[PDB]
Curated annotation (Swiss-Prot), chain A:
This is MYND-type zinc finger-containing chromatin reader ZMYND8. Residues 59-166 form the Bromo domain. It comes from the Eukaryota. It comes from Homo sapiens. Monomer and homodimer. Interacts with NuRD subcomplexes containing GATAD2A. Interacts with the histone deacetylase NuRD complex subunit CHD4; the interaction is direct, appears to occur with monomeric ZMYND8, and is increased following DNA damage. Interacts (via N-terminus) with the P-TEFb complex subunit CCNT1 (via central region); the interaction is direct and the association appears to occur between homodimeric ZMYND8 and the activated form of the P-TEFb complex. Interacts (via N-terminus) with DBN1 (via ADF-H domain); the interaction leads to sequestering of ZMYND8 in the cytoplasm. Residues 1-182 are annotated as: Interaction with histone H3K4me0. It is linked to Mutations in ZMYND8 may be the cause of syndromic intellectual disability with variable cardiovascular, ophthalmologic and minor skeletal anomalies. Zn(2+) 1 binds at residues 5, 8, 25, 28.
Swiss-Prot record, chain B:
The gene is DBN1. The chain holds residues 1 to 133 of 649 of the full protein. Changing residue 10 to D/G: Loss of binding to ZMYND8. Loss of ZMYND8 cytoplasmic localization. It is linked to Alzheimer disease: Alzheimer disease is a neurodegenerative disorder characterized by progressive dementia, loss of cognitive abilities, and deposition of fibrillar amyloid proteins as intraneuronal neurofibrillary tangles, extracellular amyloid plaques and vascular amyloid deposits. The major constituents of these plaques are neurotoxic amyloid-beta protein 40 and amyloid-beta protein 42, that are produced by the proteolysis of the transmembrane APP protein. The cytotoxic C-terminal fragments (CTFs) and the caspase-cleaved products, such as C31, are also implicated in neuronal death. It comes from Homo sapiens (Human). Residues 3-130 form the ADF-H domain. This is Drebrin.
Amino acid sequence: NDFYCWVCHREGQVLCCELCPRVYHAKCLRLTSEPEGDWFCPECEKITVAECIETQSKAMTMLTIEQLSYLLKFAIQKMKQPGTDAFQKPVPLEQHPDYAEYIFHPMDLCTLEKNAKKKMYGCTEAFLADAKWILHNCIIYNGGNHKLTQIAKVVIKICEHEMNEIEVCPECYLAACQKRDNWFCEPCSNPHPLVWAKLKGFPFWPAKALRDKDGQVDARFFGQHDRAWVPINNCYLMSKEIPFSKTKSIFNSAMQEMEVYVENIRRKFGVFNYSPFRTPYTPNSQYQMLLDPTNPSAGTAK
Amino acid sequence: MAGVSFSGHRLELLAAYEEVIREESAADWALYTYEDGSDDLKLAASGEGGLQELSGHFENQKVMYGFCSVKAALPKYVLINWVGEDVPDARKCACASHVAKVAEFFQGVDVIVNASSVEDIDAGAIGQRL
Ligand SMILES: [Zn+2]
Ligand SMILES: [Zn+2]
Ligand SMILES: [Zn+2]
């Protein structure tokens, strides 16, 4: 087991996880009572939940461990930004002979890579938790205000970001990693409804509704291809007439790209139903995939 | 971290870029940078005079992105990935992961050129690259 706390990276009396090497201060878990018997730490428990078939994420249901490993390889590549040389290969004892005296569990991006390849991450949380060893160990051996520690903070933040992308949509993620011909125009297996998204001070814009949380929808914009939250309450299902009216040229480009997407959805699933003017987007909307918009009881495309 | 953001100021960013793409508009460069203490991109400046003029607006304390149109036939598009010599290494590292997303935002980038002094911005060398 590790001697330094997983949260504050300092020593002192700690609780020792029974599955993994990590250790925690009670104060740092904000414990309110003492654990009774064998103790599993928050990282182990999070992973246990995320990898249980009855409670896995929507991204994990649709991925096998091998597919997810491929996505993880892409994420490792995004973590090796220029400037990250100190973390790409295990620290040599020739450069730091005392290293093993402080770091109970070494970790580097190359090891992350090989482990991902050996298909030993069952979920994105497993992966980010393993990645954080790099930062933890950096803080222990170089100190929290070190320059290298600043870099390790960047790579753990890129890691968080990519894990989140994979979890929002694996298929989106893979298509954006490969960047094939018109990659943005490929429908996903559960196709995101197309909407007019609206940001302050910007016209209505064609977008993929990727998800809803607390009155917002996470729109991935045609043309520009970034993602941003927009209020549910001024969001409308894609239509032939625009909700209002600017910056014409790039808009026409985005429209063309959306129309290619519509054609692809029609070939993949057989339908795409445009909405009447200013039809408010609802969460988990299905109108666009209805076999007969007149008659919802017929169901949607499989 | 969400990373580079194009939400706040979106209209200004795309208005400058659209000016650069338009053949009729005189402007052939736009210059973007981050807002202080934030990952949201903002328009810093824009104008005519191509690479020669644009190299005059780069700041040594900032990460900036230069989108310049370069022409006798159809124009090609250069994105200058500027990192000032006085930008901290950690922020160079974080911003490095934004470049691709910026190129994706300003559709049609033909070449990306990394730069930290004006001397990295040679109109000839860039031209031969295209
Ligand atoms: Zn602690
Ligand atoms: Zn554990
Ligand atoms: Zn998707």
